[PDB]
């Protein structure tokens, strides 16, 4: 086992465990496609 | 008292074209002390007619990308030019400018055949031409822009084909003649 603590492969999507394209702002930690689907339930409404 | 640059009053100025007067308004509400107006001159078709001529000149000067959106600099340059005009070749600089403007418009142009030119358009062309010529003179010379610009203005006033703008105008006229 090798240091898995700080890098892209360290953490992942909460939802589908994908190491690519994670929204890491506000500790959301959802890969952006998944976020786009669940943006309604999380309370992210498109206004402008 | 109402004034421009706290120096050249433009109560003394004269015109003698009619058409040009109609086009460029240096008037009672188009009085101005320093060119920089934040006016809404392009929200209508003819609102550019209300615009003071100095402002227009400054705008013209402002051109060329790496010098674009540097209004203050342009204003300074124009002031310098005016000063030069006042000093060397002694006359009210505003009058000189007016004369140049009068000179500058190509009265007839070519098209896909020869047609006439509206006064406003002609004025605009003159403004452009004078600035462009000045820029050309400046570029990779030494002289300085303000001096060159002043010289150009004086030439325009004279109506002499040593400067560039005048030459261009003449060429245009010739072309028009050829066409019809």
């Amino acid at each position: 086992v090798h240091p898995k603590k700080y890098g892209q492969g360290s953490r992942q999507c909460r939802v589908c465990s994908n190491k690519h394209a994670i929204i890491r702002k506000y500790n959301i930690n959802i890969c952006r496609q998944c976020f786009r689907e669940r943006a309604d339930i999380i309370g992210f409404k498109k206004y402008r | 008292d109402i004034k421009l640059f706290k120096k050249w009053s433009y109560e003394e100025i004269n015109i003698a074209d009619l058409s040009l007067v109609d086009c460029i308004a240096v008037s009672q509400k188009a009085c101005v002390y320093t060119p920089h107006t934040a006016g809404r001159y392009q929200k209508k078709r003819f609102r550019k007619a209300l615009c003071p001529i100095v402002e227009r000149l400054v705008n013209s000067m402002m051109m060329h990308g790496r010098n674009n959106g540097k209004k203050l600099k342009a204003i300074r340059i124009v002031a310098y030019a005016f000063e030069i005009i006042h000093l060397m070749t002694g006359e009210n600089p505003l009058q000189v400018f007016v004369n140049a403007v009068q000179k500058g418009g190509p009265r007839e142009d070519s098209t896909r055949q020869a047609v006439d030119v509206s006064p406003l358009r002609r004025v605009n062309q003159a403004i452009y031409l004078i600035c462009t010529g000045a820029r050309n003179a400046a570029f990779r010379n030494i002289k300085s822009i303000s001096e060159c610009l002043a010289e150009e203005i004086i030439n325009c006033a004279n109506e002499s084909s040593s400067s560039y703008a005048i030459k261009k105008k003449d060429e245009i006229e010739r072309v028009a003649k050829a066409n019809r």
């Binding site: 909460r14 506000y26 500790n27 959301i28 959802i30 339930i41 999380i42 309370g43 | -």
Partner: protein, 157 residues
């Protein structure tokens, strides 16, 4: 101690997770809910934490799983929706469906507004993917509810 912004996002995430969990669990239910036999569910949540469209969609999926003539089922659903007092409906079923290639099938009844914030408000929408013989059939149900008044109407007395 956690900041307000951080908190809000976290809460949202939790909500989403809960919803997903419910979906996973309740294939046999008219699910909408989200407000907190069930004992187990409660335990699970504790461990974790320290008329309607969705229901209709679920029903459709169940029917598909059971194995009906599809079109008939859709018609039945539409009828049910009508009975339940809907101003308009729409169902789509795209996927494999009988043939190998393609085949999206619309099923509208009453009028269905699509554009505007009215759409966002006055329609409940739901999407389920019913796994079947050789792939997935793709439900999407869209119901226009009774309005609290539409922006298009100008009712003179």
């Amino acid at each position: 101690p956690i900041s307000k912004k951080r908190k809000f996002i976290n809460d949202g995430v939790f909500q989403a997770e809960l919803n997903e969990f419910l979906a996973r669990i309740l294939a046999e239910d008219g699910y909408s809910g989200v407000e907190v036999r069930i004992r187990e569910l409660t335990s699970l949540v504790q461990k974790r934490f320290f008329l309607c469209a969705m229901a209709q969609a679920e029903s459709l999926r169940y029917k598909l799983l059971k194995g009906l003539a599809v079109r008939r089922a859709c018609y039945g659903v539409l009828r049910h929706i009508m009975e339940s007092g809907a101003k308009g409906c729409e169902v789509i079923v795209s996927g494999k469906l009988r043939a190998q290639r393609a085949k999206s099938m619309k099923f509208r009844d009453g009028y269905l507004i699509s554009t505007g914030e009215p759409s966002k408000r006055f329609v409940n929408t739901a999407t389920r993917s019913a796994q079947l013989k050789q792939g997935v059939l793709g439900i999407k149900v869209k119901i226009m509810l009774p309005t609290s008044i539409l922006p298009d109407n100008i009712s003179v007395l």
